[PDB]
Amino acid sequence: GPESVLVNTYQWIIRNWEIVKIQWSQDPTMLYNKMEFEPFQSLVPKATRSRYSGFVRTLFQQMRDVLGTFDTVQIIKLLPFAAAPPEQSRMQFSSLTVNVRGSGLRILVRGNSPVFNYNKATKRLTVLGKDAGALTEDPDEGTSGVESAVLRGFLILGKEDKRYGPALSINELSNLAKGEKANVLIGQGDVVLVMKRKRDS
């Protein structure tokens, strides 16, 4: 069933992470088009599939372009959304819908959610209340706290910094100049400092 499709997709990515990481790094196009992501894509609503994919593919390229910000879990989380033919847009998506429990459940782009829950204490991924397997320590993992694959055209720099003013919503960022910093209401009471990048991916 649909719940098992999600679990099995993420399980598959983890089991095959050595080759998936390599392709993600050097031939993402042939990774994104793998048939193994088609069942997951069937669960992504037809109307938003392509925009989700353009968004995610752009976020992944930010990660490649902004050196030393590799985030293993973020790649695994978002990867299956990259499989649809991409469509461009200006929008920020804070969450991505999958059709599972008879209905839309949303995976949060930043951090854990009920659908996608990575446990840093146990090093295991849980997807819809099911184990999707263990992650191994990767020396390439970014340790600086800069998040390059959450917002399209922005880096999350770290904690709220009151100097840069009161928080903007995700939908209020489009007037920021290249290189300008602001506080942003990223989710769940969390305010983070962000920077609009000068060059887009």
Would you kindly provide a written description of the structure presented here, covering whatever features stand out?
This protein has about 200 residues and is an alpha+beta fold. The strands form three sheets. A four-stranded mixed beta sheet has the order 6-9-8-7, with no helix packed on it. A three-stranded antiparallel beta sheet has the order 3-4-5, with helices on one face. The protein is about 30% helix and about 20% strand. It has helices at about 1-15, 15-25, 30, 40, 50-65, 70-80; strands at about 95-100, 105-110, 115-120, 125, 130-135, 155-160, 170, 180-185, 190-195. It folds into two domains: about 1-145, no CATH class; about 145-200, 2-Layer Sandwich (Defensin A-like). It has six helices and nine strands; from the N terminus they run ααααααβββββββββ.
- The proportion of residues in beta strands is 15-25%
Helix content: 25-40%
Number of domains: 2
- The Rg value, from CA coordinates, equals 16 Å
Structural class: alpha+beta
Spatial strand arrangement across the major sheet: 6-9-8-7
Shape verdict: globular
The helix/strand series, from N terminus to C terminus, equals HHHHHHEEEEEEEEE
Distance between the termini: 37 Å
Assembly status: monomer
Instruction: Let me know the number of strands.
Output: 9
Main β-sheet: number of strands, strand sense, barrel status? Answer: 4 strands, mixed
Total of DSSP H or I helical runs spanning 4+ residues: 6
Site (Avian adaptation): 87
Motif (Nuclear localization signal): 196-199
Domain Influenza RNA polymerase PB2 C-terminal: 143-201
Domain Influenza RNA polymerase PB2 sixth: 1-140
